[PDB]
Structures are given as structure tokens and as C-alpha cells.
Amino acid sequence: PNFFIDRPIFAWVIAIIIMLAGGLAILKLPVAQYPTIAPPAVTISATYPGADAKTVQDTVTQVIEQNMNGIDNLMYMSSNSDSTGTVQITLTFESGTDADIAQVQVQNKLQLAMPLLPQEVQQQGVSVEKSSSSFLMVVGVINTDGTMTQEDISDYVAANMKDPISRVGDVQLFGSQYAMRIWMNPTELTKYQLTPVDVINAIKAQNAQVAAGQLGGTPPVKGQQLNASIIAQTRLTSTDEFGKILLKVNQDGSQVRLRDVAKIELGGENYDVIAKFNGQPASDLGIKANALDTATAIRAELKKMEPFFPPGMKIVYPYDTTPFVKISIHEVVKTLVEAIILVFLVMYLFLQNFRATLIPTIAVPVVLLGTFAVLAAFGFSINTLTMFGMVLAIGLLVDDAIVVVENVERVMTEEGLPPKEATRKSMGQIQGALVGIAMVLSAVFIPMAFFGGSTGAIYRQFSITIVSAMALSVLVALILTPALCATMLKPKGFFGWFNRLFDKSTHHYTDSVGNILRSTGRYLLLYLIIVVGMAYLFVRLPSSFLPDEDQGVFLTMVQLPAGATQERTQKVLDEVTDYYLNKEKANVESVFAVNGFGFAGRGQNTGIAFVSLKDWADRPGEKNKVEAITQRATAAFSQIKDAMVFAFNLPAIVELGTATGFDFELIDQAGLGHEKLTQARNQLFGEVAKYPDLLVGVRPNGLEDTPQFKIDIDQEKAQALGVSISDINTTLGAAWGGSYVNDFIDRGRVKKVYVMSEAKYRMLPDDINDWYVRGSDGQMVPFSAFSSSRWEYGSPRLERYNGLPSMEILGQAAPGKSTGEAMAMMEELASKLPSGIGYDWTGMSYQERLSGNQAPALYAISLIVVFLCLAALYESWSIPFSVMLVVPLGVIGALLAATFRGLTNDVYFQVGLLTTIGLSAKNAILIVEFAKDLMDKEGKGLVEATLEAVRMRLRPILMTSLAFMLGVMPLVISSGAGSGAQNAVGTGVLGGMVTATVLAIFFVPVFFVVVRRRF
């Protein structure tokens, strides 16, 4: 309005205020390369020392799966069961809910079922926690001295850091804590006729701590004048003085002390997990609100102890992402900077007035700040993509300002109107046009919130960003612009030539237009031909979900055959470290190799290797680039190999994996039995490999049967010999498996006690015979007495899906094939199989199929609402249609690019499409808005009004367009870190806009012409 044509500063102040607010935003908000994107998933952990997967499923898990019931938004419930007595159970809860609450919903249940359970486990640990696979980061620690061991490290740590640290979704500690370990000598127990049972018991007794009452505490006596507390034993505090743990005394008189018949050692709480950083032994932490603050408070909690470390105690940040992120963000900001400073001069071109250009110079930043303050009002996680949203906001931000600029400029110079009335005339013209364009453009991005999914939220954030940005841009366009002009604007040979040439060219081209408008059929047909090629492209699409880029690290798994060791594992893992360090040294900065932690649960035949790399400024070799490195290492690890080795990159999202892929999950409905499930499953592998035209990479994520060694016990003779079957089982377990006897103390820290057989006696079938047992009467006896032994094959893995023994199938559809038709193939093959066999999909292969294929609804709805705003501006049923025909034009321009260059589809792509769409609209909008009134209220010739409108306005349509174009260019120009997404974005919008803008100038007129002459 002109409320501000009373008052220059009132709006100056509004604006300074709003920018100040956006500035307030800078600090109080989050920072991340990505927002919260996954649904909230919960996990349960359970432990049973020394047994089978089948064992627990039949003892522990199956219970839980039975007695869970009544839990909100319970999407689904998967469960693993491994043969190290470990269970991880994952329940995903429907999107947009509260972990903090369902965690409890679930823990109450986990506690319904506990007493059903053992005392071993019930006492060991039964934990509830939350899902996070992608480790926020990692830390490693090595002994530079190279003199001590990993358990030393881990013990130090736990005594020092982990608890301070945990006060953060998860902390994981590879290794274990100092726990005392009683390595049992069986031979000498036989000598002295002892089953370990006596050992366990004597230990339970000689290591404890008990009440002592007090002296005269509660009711005293008359004249009593003293009170104190008594104290009994404590927990024995040394291996040495467990050596003193007395059992027995010989009849001769000699006693029986423990130390003489076993190794009393410090060792692992367990260790089926080992680490070596650059090959040198070390230990670690996997660490997981906020990203940067997290990192920095962590570095702080670290520094304190940094000087307090023992000698040869060095840290490492082997697996990290933060600096990557910051660098990406910083340069993506340099982007904005350069894009704006371009405009700074693009004005000077057609204005040449050091203050003809400053209103735009000024406004934009204020608007970006308004967007900051938007997300401030609503939080919404300042982060990368929501920042790209700022990038694309630019030209929208730009247009209306450029517009008013040239409007007033022409009104004054073309005619000689003082600033006030010149401007207010421009306004009497253009007031509502801008409202129109804004309401239009919003019709594109608004409809996306009602679109659901993790992508649902991606679109929510990016689009609401875009749209609020436009809102504020408009508002200011309608506030301060009107006065700035009459605030600094009074009523070359390096550019004079250019103005000359511009004037010549505009006349040449408008003349070509006057010539061609007479011809319509040919160019009319060309429009449709363009549409057809557009559809040809829309069908020739490659397709994806998101890209992945160098992040300073990557990974490689290692799988050995059934039957394995830490040793045959670690030898190979060492060959790997050797390769990476020796042949590709220049980029291989370090390595964090591991032994034990598999990717399909945990085990022995599994290993994982993290790879850390050099700086972005010293890794320019495209040949020795990230993915080519992996490529060539693969061949290196597919040649002289006797074990499977995937070697590859890190998908840069929290466990979403291949989106063109799928993960089928087969289930035994009705008591068919594990064996039949396996049979039909391998059978289906063999049967489905028949169609390598739709279905590719069909491997099971589960693992195969394995030699299980059974020891059958003949109850009869056991009873016959005065024996406790319990004594049998207990000797067995305490020797071979382990046992949580009790606790002891060290440095105010309690710690565990295990009593397990010495190593070299507990490793082989024949070793069994070395074991004896004390019958009732008292005489040591072998297992050979009553023990049968044999072999078979059973699985070490057992998975279940919501109640039921289930198996997994990792697969992918052909690239030019949706995952849906692959689901059709899978159902066709499997549903044809015997009764009792059901199935389901999951994860991606579930999520993306429950809601997919709605984006067309977005675009139809936007189309509609835009038609509406059009007729609103026009009160014309007929006119709107014309301008909508502008949609397709920019489209091809982007589409063709994806083939003109090696680029593909994603979110970014849909987004740039919608963007260029709204932009072409904006362009034609004000063109026609002019021409119409220029006809009606000037009574001009319809065609003549078109020509007048285009002539009076040709320079800015060029200006703003090309300006946004040049602002976007650098990305496509830009390479290096992050350049993946950067270029992916910069490409499509240029491609589309070039076409849209270079072409509308000839057909907007024709569209309107034919609309009017056929109506």
C-alpha cells in the first residue's frame, strides 16, 4: 500500500527488527547434515552366557514374543536369536509418536515375563533401549608405549569415562571390564576329588558382606552412653587372597587352598570382541538433540582427562562425520554469498546507478533471516536440506524487488514523474499482481505437508521453508520497496554500447514476433511435440532416492565360512590392513579393524573394518577417488580369496539401504518346522534365480546350518551311580560355558567373577574325558560312564517376525524395474508354496509400499489451486487455463539435462521441477496481467496490447531470470566435497529455466490470443 507513502522510516525499522530476530535465531537452533528422519524404533537386549540360539528361543525369547501385548502404534516386531546367548529385538512404532512413552509401555511388559526366566539372566542383564545403527561417531585409544593390552585400556576407560559420557542415545564399549577369572585345572580337582560346584559354593561364601547390627542402637538402656556400628567381612580384594580361598583339609592335616589348582587372573568380563587401530592393539567407544554441541561437549569431557592419562595413552577420532558436515555447510553458504553478489552487479548493468540497485541488495538478507526466525518459531532443525531450501528461495526473493525497481524507474524516466507519484502509479498498477503470484507459487509447496513419510518430513521441512521464505519476501516487497525508491532516488562506452545492442535486439525480436504471431499452426504443433518429448523423458527416467558421497570414511565386512576363529579371522583382517596401508597409502589415513562384531548379529566368522581417509584438499585424484578405490579393492579381494568380502561405501542415511531394493521375510504360519522353512527357502532361492530380468542379488541375510555337537545324557546310570543330574549340568556349564558366581571390589568399583575351565582342556571332544564327577558316596567318575556324543547340523541363527520363526531375503529389482513388480514376482513364486507358509515385507519393502504413488495427487492439487488463484485474479473462467500451459516448458529443460549429463532423479529433482514450474508461471503471470488491462482500460488492440505489454516489459524478465541462473551456476561449476548434492540440484533448475524463459516470450501471447479468439 501507501501507508508507507507517508512515512519513510517506519518500515526501515520493521526491517531492521526482523533481521535482528533472524539473527537471534542463528544461535538457539540445532545443526545437522540431516534431521530426524526415521521412525522411532525400540530395542531389547538379552543375554544367556554360553548356549545356542535355539536354546534361548526355546527358553527366553519365545516367552517374550508370547507375553507382549497391548502396545501403542505397534507397527511390527522383529527378533534375532544368536548362538552366543544374545537376543536383540526390534519393535518399530508408527511414525510421529513418542519413544519416551512406548519405551515404558514395553518395559512394563519385559517385566511381566522376567520371573518366568532364569536366575543367570535375570541377574545378568535385561535391557531396553532405542534404535540407532548409524553411529554418531567413534573414539579409539591406543597405547603409544605399545607395552600393555586392550583389557587394560577398557578397564581404565570404564573406571574413567563411560559413565561421565553417558550423561545421548547409546554408548557401546568393544571389549570389557576387568573381571576376575578362575581358570580351572580339572586334573588336580580329580586328584583331590572335586567338582567345581564346591568351588562355586566356597566362593559364594568366602566373598560377601553382611549386616552387623549396631551397639545399643534402637532401644538403649538406662545409663547407656554409647552407640556404634559393627562390621563383618568384606569382599576379598585380590587374586592373591582368593588364592587363600580355602576348600578342604587332608586327613594328614594338610589344607586345601585354591591358588594351587587354578589360575586366578584378571581378564575380560568377556572377550569375543577385539580391536586394532592401524593394526596396533587398542580399544574404543561408539558414541551417539544436537550434533555439534554433542561433539564439542564430548571433546570437553575428554580434554579434562587428556592430561590425566597414563603414559602411552593416545586418542583417535577414526570414525567421524562432523567436519565433513561443517565444510559442506560453509561452502553451501559461500554459494549464497556469490549468488547475491552477482545480482549486485547485474543491477549495475541495466541501472548503472550506484543506488539504483540497493533496495534489492538490502532486502534479501532480511528475508533469509526471516526464514531463520520462522524455523525459530517452529524449531524444525536448521540443517543441510532446509538450507538448500534457502538457496532455491533466491530468485523468488529477487523478482518482486527487481520488478518494483524497474516499474518506478520507467514510470519516472519514460515520463518524468516525481518519485512519489511515479511510484504510487506503478503501484496503482501492480499492487495485487504480487499477491497473485505469491498465492500461486504457494500452491506448489503447501500441498506437500499432507504427504507422509520420512520423505514426508523431508518435503515438509524443505517446502515450508520455501514457502515461508516467499511469504516474507512478498510482505517486504509490499512495505519497504515503495519508499526506498523515494529515499535515495533522485528524479558509458563500457555499457552504452551494450544498451545500444540491447535496444537493437529487442526491436529485432519483437519484429520477429509481429511476423510470426501470424503463423500459429506450426508453433502450436511444436508445443505438443515438446510435450510428447517431455513424456518420452519422464518415461526414460533413471530413478533413485538419494545420493551418497565421500565422507572421509567407508567400511568393509568380512565373512568366513561356518566354523572359524578370531585367528583365521584376524590373519585375514591383517592382510586387509596391510593392503590398505601399503598400496593406497596416500589416501588411506588410518584403519580401525575389529574381530567378532558381525553385521548379521555377532559371531566368530565375522569381522568389520572401518576406513578413514585424508583431507579433502589432498584427495583430488578422481582415479583414486572414493568409489573407484572400493571398486579396485573389490577385485583385489575377489581374486585370491577363500572367503566372502564385500568392500564398499557407507549409505549416508540411518539404515535405509537400497530403495530400489527389497527385503522379503518368510514366516512359518502353522507348525511346519525350521527345517521345512529352510528347505522351501533355499528352494526358492534356486527357483527365483530363474528370472534375472526382474530380480537380482537374491541372497539370504540369515546364515546357514552348522555342525552342532550334541552330548546326550543317559539319565539311568546317572541315577544308578548316586549322582545329581544337576551336578552334571553345573560342572559342564561352569567349565565350558561360564558362570556369574558373584562380585568383588577394586577401587570402589564392583566387578564380576567367572569360574571357567582352563583353556587348553576345554576345546575338543576328547578333552571331555578329562572331566570327572563326584558321585554321592564320593568317588570321581567319567562322562564316558554315562555320556553319548555325536554330530549334526543346526543353525546358529534364529529370527522371528511378530511371533514366528522367520527368515530373511535381501534382494533388488532390476534398475529399470520398480520394487513393486519384484514383490509381484516374489508373491507369485512363494504363495504357490505349501500351507503353513506365510510371509510379509518390512522396512523399505514395507514403508515405500504402504503409501507410495501419491505425488501425482500433490501435483493435481497444485494444478487445481493455481487454476483457482488465476481465475481469482481474473474473474475469468477462460483466461487462467492459458497460463497453466506454461508448466511443461521448463520441465523438459531439466529432464533433458539428466541425460545431457549423467544425472538422475531424487527429491532434489521433484523439487527443482516444482520450482522452475512456479518460476515460469511467475514470468507469464505479470506479462498477461499487463497485456489484459493494457487492452481493456486502454481500449487497445488485443494483439497491440500484447505487444505494448511485452515491449514495456522485456528487460526485467531477462534480468531476474538470468540473474537467478547465474546465481545457481556455481554448483554445477562447483566440485569436491558435497558437490554431489550441490550439482545434482544446480543442474535441473538451470536446465529447465533456460527453456522456460527463452520460449514463453513467444507463446504466452499466442496462448492468450487463441483463448480470447475462441471464447
How does DSSP assign 697-724, residue by residue? EEE-SS---EEEEEEEE-HHHHHHTS--
Residues 625 and 668 in one domain: yes
User: Is there a domain that residue 151 lies in?
Assistant: no
User: What's the total number of domains in the chain?
Assistant: 4
User: Could you tell me the CA-to-CA distances from 25 to 20, 142, 457, 954 in Å, in that order?
Assistant: 9, 41, 21, 39
Of 940, 912, 939, give the one whose Cα is nearest residue 996. 912
First CA to last CA distance, the chain: 35
Q: Last residue of a domain, which of 103, 130, 157? A: 130
Q: CA-CA distance, 278 to 610, in Å (whole number)?
A: 10
Q: Last residue of a domain, which of 787, 817, 848? A: 848
Q: CA-CA distance, 932 to 939, in Å (whole number)?
A: 10
Which residue type is seen at 171?
V
User: Is there a domain that residue 785 lies in?
Assistant: no
Residues 420 and 497 in one domain: no
Residues 451 and 403 in one domain: yes
Q: CA-CA distance, 174 to 192, in Å (whole number)?
A: 39
Q: Which residues contact 865 (CB under 8 A, 6 or more apart)?
A: 443, 446, 447
Q: CA-CA distance, 566 to 997, in Å (whole number)?
A: 65
Which residue type is seen at 195?
T
What is the CATH number for 820? 3.30.70.1430
The DSSP result for 794-858, as a single string, is: E-SB-EEESSSEEEEEEEEE-TTS-HHHHHHHHHHHHTTS-TTEEEE--HHHHHHHHS-S-HHHH
Are the C-beta atoms of residues 982 and 968 closer than 8 Å to each other?
Answer: no
Of 301, 697, 384, give the one whose Cα is nearest residue 551. 384
Helix, coil or strand: residue 131: coil
Q: Whose grid coordinates read 546317572?
A: 718
Q: Which residues contact 963 (CB under 8 A, 6 or more apart)?
A: 342, 343, 346, 395, 398, 402
Q: CA-CA distance, 618 to 356, in Å (whole number)?
A: 45
Helix, coil or strand: residue 749: strand
The values of phi and psi at residue 698, to 5°, are -85, 90
- 753: β partners: 180, 742
User: Is there a domain that residue 93 lies in?
Assistant: yes
Instruction: State this model's resolution in angstroms.
Output: 4.6
Q: CA-CA distance, 1002 to 512, in Å (whole number)?
A: 10
Pairing mode, if any, of strands 280-287 and 588-595? unpaired
User: Is there a domain that residue 662 lies in?
Assistant: yes
Q: Which residues contact 236 (CB under 8 A, 6 or more apart)?
A: 206, 207, 242, 244, 245, 744
User: Could you tell me the CA-to-CA distances from 702 to 560, 765, 808, 810, 827 in Å, in that order?
Assistant: 14, 28, 6, 9, 20
Express the helix, strand and coil content of the chain in percent, nearest 5 each: 50, 15, 30
Of 569, 533, 406, 469, give the one whose Cα is nearest residue 892. 533
Which residue type is seen at 873?
L
Of 485, 483, 476, 482, give the one whose Cα is nearest residue 398. 476
Residues 382 and 456 in one domain: yes
Question: Is 591 exposed, middle or buried, given 0-12, 13-18 or 19+ CB atoms closer than 10 A?
Answer: buried
User: Could you tell me the CA-to-CA distances from 254 to 152, 526, 596, 865 in Å, in that order?
Assistant: 37, 110, 46, 99
CA count, 13 A, side-chain hemisphere, 839? 25
Question: Is 691 exposed, middle or buried, given 0-12, 13-18 or 19+ CB atoms closer than 10 A?
Answer: middle
Which residue type is seen at 251?
Q
Q: b/e per residue, 206-232, with b = 16+ CB within 10 A?
A: bbeeeeeeeeeeeeeeeeeeeeeeeee
The values of phi and psi at residue 277, to 5°, are -95, 120
User: Could you tell me the CA-to-CA distances from 313 to 233, 308, 590, 972 in Å, in that order?
Assistant: 37, 10, 17, 46
Q: CA-CA distance, 949 to 1005, in Å (whole number)?
A: 10
Q: CA-CA distance, 237 to 242, in Å (whole number)?
A: 8
Helix, coil or strand: residue 590: strand
Residue 29 gets which letter from DSSP? S
Torsion of CA 54, 60, 66, 67, to 10 degrees: -170
Longest dimension (CA), the chain: 132
Length of the chain: 1015
Cβ atoms within 10 Å of 295's Cβ, excluding its own: 21
User: Is there a domain that residue 527 lies in?
Assistant: yes
Question: Is 13 exposed, middle or buried, given 0-12, 13-18 or 19+ CB atoms closer than 10 A?
Answer: exposed
Question: Is 567 exposed, middle or buried, given 0-12, 13-18 or 19+ CB atoms closer than 10 A?
Answer: exposed
User: Is there a domain that residue 900 lies in?
Assistant: yes
Domain range for residue 1008? 493-540+853-1015
3-state secondary structure 189-237: HHHCCCCHHHHHHHHHHHCCCCCCCECCCCCCCCCCCCCCECCCCCCCC
Residues 821 and 687 in one domain: yes
Cβ atoms within 10 Å of 288's Cβ, excluding its own: 15
Residues 53 and 116 in one domain: yes
Cβ atoms within 10 Å of 400's Cβ, excluding its own: 26
Per-residue cell: 966? 547465474
- 707: β partners: 793
Per-residue cell: 780? 570321581
Helix, coil or strand: residue 619: coil
Pairing mode, if any, of strands 86-93 and 41-47? antiparallel
Residues 520 and 465 in one domain: no
Q: CA-CA distance, 195 to 772, in Å (whole number)?
A: 8
CA 51 to chain centre: 34
Residues 582 and 666 in one domain: yes
H/E stretch holding 300: helix 292-303
Pairing mode, if any, of strands 553-559 and 606-613? antiparallel
Cβ atoms within 10 Å of 454's Cβ, excluding its own: 18
Helix, coil or strand: residue 509: helix
Torsion of CA 233, 237, 241, 243, to 10 degrees: 110
Cβ atoms within 10 Å of 461's Cβ, excluding its own: 22
User: Is there a domain that residue 62 lies in?
Assistant: yes
Residues 601 and 452 in one domain: no
Of 480, 491, 490, give the one whose Cα is nearest residue 8. 480
Which residue type is seen at 609?
A
What is the CATH number for 454? 1.20.1640.10
The values of phi and psi at residue 776, to 5°, are -75, -55
The DSSP result for 755-809, as a single string, is: EEE-GGGSSSTGGGGG-EEE-SSS-EEESTTTEEEEEEEE-SB-EEESSSEEEEE
Which residue type is seen at 312?
G
Inter-residue long-range contacts of 142-149, CB under 8 Å, 24+ positions, other chains counted: 142/277, 142/280, 142/281, 142/282, 142/314, 142/316, 143/280, 143/281, 143/282, 143/312, 143/313, 143/314, 144/311, 144/312, 144/313, 144/314, 145/311, 145/312, 146/280, 146/312, 147/312, 149/281
Residues 833 and 929 in one domain: no
Which residue type is seen at 746?
D
Q: CA-CA distance, 801 to 298, in Å (whole number)?
A: 38
Q: CA-CA distance, 618 to 934, in Å (whole number)?
A: 61
Question: Is 793 exposed, middle or buried, given 0-12, 13-18 or 19+ CB atoms closer than 10 A?
Answer: exposed
CA 646 to chain centre: 21
Residues 569 and 467 in one domain: no
Q: CA-CA distance, 514 to 873, in Å (whole number)?
A: 28
Are the C-beta atoms of residues 236 and 242 closer than 8 Å to each other?
Answer: yes
Q: CA-CA distance, 663 to 822, in Å (whole number)?
A: 11
Q: CA-CA distance, 651 to 287, in Å (whole number)?
A: 19
Q: CA-CA distance, 15 to 233, in Å (whole number)?
A: 76
Per-residue cell: 666? 518368510
User: Is there a domain that residue 590 lies in?
Assistant: yes
Pairing mode, if any, of strands 86-93 and 74-79? antiparallel
Q: CA-CA distance, 608 to 553, in Å (whole number)?
A: 13
Of 21, 957, 959, 7, give the one whose Cα is nearest residue 479. 7
Per-residue cell: 958? 531477462
- 698: β partners: none
The DSSP result for 676-691, as a single string, is: HHHHHHHHHHHHHTT-
CA 673 to chain centre: 37
CA 1012 to chain centre: 53
User: Could you tell me the CA-to-CA distances from 926 to 50, 262, 399, 953 in Å, in that order?
Assistant: 77, 92, 11, 9
- 316: β partners: 140
Q: b/e per residue, 568-579, with b = 16+ CB within 10 A?
A: bbbebbeebbee
Per-residue cell: 1000? 514463453
Q: CA-CA distance, 108 to 44, in Å (whole number)?
A: 13
Question: Is 83 exposed, middle or buried, given 0-12, 13-18 or 19+ CB atoms closer than 10 A?
Answer: buried
Angle between helices 454-477 and 419-445 (to 10 degrees): 170
Q: CA-CA distance, 856 to 838, in Å (whole number)?
A: 33
Q: CA-CA distance, 819 to 988, in Å (whole number)?
A: 26
Q: Last residue of a domain, which of 848, 866, 884? A: 848
The DSSP result for 93-119, as a single string, is: E-SS--HHHHHHHHHHHHHHSGGGS-S
Pairing mode, if any, of strands 588-595 and 661-668? unpaired
Residues 585 and 696 in one domain: yes
The sign of the CA dihedral 951, 953, 956, 958 is negative
* Rg for the chain, CA atoms, rounded: 37
Q: CA-CA distance, 155 to 150, in Å (whole number)?
A: 9
Q: How was this structure determined?
A: cryo-EM
